Amino acid sequence: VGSLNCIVAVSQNMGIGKNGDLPWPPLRNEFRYFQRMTTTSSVEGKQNLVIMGKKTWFSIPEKNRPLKGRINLVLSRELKEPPQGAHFLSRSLDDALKLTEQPELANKVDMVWIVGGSSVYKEAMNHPGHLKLFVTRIMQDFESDTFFPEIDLEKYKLLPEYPGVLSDVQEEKGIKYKFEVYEKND
Numbered sequence: 109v110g111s112l113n114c115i116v117a118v119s120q121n122m123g124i125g126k127n128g129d130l131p132w133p134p135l136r137n138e139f140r141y142f143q144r145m146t147t148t149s150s151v152e153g154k155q156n157l158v159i160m161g162k163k164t165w166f167s168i169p170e171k172n173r174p175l176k177g178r179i180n181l182v183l184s185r186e187l188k189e190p191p192q193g194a195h196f197l198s199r200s201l202d203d204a205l206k207l208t209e210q211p212e213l214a215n216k217v218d219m220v221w222i223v224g225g226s227s228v229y230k231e232a233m234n235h236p237g238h239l240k241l242f243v244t245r246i247m248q249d250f251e252s253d254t255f256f257p258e259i260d261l262e263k264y265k266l267l268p269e270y271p272g273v274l275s276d277v278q279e280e281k282g283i284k285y286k287f288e289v290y291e292k293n294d
């Protein structure tokens with residue numbers, strides 16, 4: 109099992125969702141960006157695992173579930189089996205990570221990508237260890253009802269470049285945004 113990572117797109121006021129969808133209109137190249145980063149594995153003959161909360165899962169369009177070419181794991185204490193289309197079900201972040209260390213997944217999983225929502229991100233970001241955050245900064249305020257947790261810059265270093273990630277400002281549908289990579293190790 110290799111790297112543990114978070115990926116998120118967030119607005120200036122730290123919003124990541126509204127009524128079970130994104131706070132901004134669909135940004136095609138940003139979704140493609142998300143798809144490329146979570147799918148691509150450096151170790152041949154392996155796949156990345158994506159871990160999400162239940163409400164994240166149901167937010168993804170049915171036709172795109174499971175996220176293709178990745179192992180899909182959903183977090184829930186209420187569910188008793190994985191949702192239709194999901195691959196795995198765990199009851200805690202600890203459990204999900206324990207699981208990747210079982211003999212089955214052990215040698216099938218490269219990168220693990222936490223893709224949301226707020227409470228999964230919170231726990232991961234505040235747990236000791238080597239962790240990257242891939243952060244798309246939507247450069248506007250947008251009305252939101254769910255929020256990215258605080259990034260402690262004493263611990264998370266913004267990297268000045270990262271291979272496969274554009275540094276310059278992007279824009280689609282008149283919304284400007286940029287990509288960022290943070291790393292801590294503690």
Ligand SMILES: NC(=O)C1=CN([C@@H]2O[C@H](COP(=O)(O)OP(=O)(O)OC[C@H]3O[C@@H](n4cnc5c(N)ncnc54)[C@H](OP(=O)(O)O)[C@@H]3O)[C@@H](O)[C@H]2O)C=CC1
Nearest residue numbers: 116117125128161162163164183184185186199224225226
């Ligand atoms: N802009 C972006 O990058 C992203 C946007 N989103 C958006 O943000 C929102 C997702 O919202 P959010 O409310 O944070 O929902 P989550 O996807 O985190 O789902 C919350 C539920 O998942 C389960 N859960 C969460 N953490 C754990 C855990 N550690 N262990 C076991 N179960 C857990 C619980 O379900 P149960 O009650 O069954 O135990 C909880 O009610 C949506 O609006 C979505 O569109 C989501 C990801 C990224």
Ligand SMILES: COc1ccc(Sc2c(C)c3c(N)nc(N)nc3n2C)cc1
Nearest residue numbers: 115116117142167168169172223224244
């Ligand atoms: C590809 O089909 C999908 C449908 C909905 C979502 S929700 C989403 C998430 C969870 C997401 C993320 N973690 N990081 C970035 N940079 N963009 C994202 N989006 C848009 C993600 C994928």
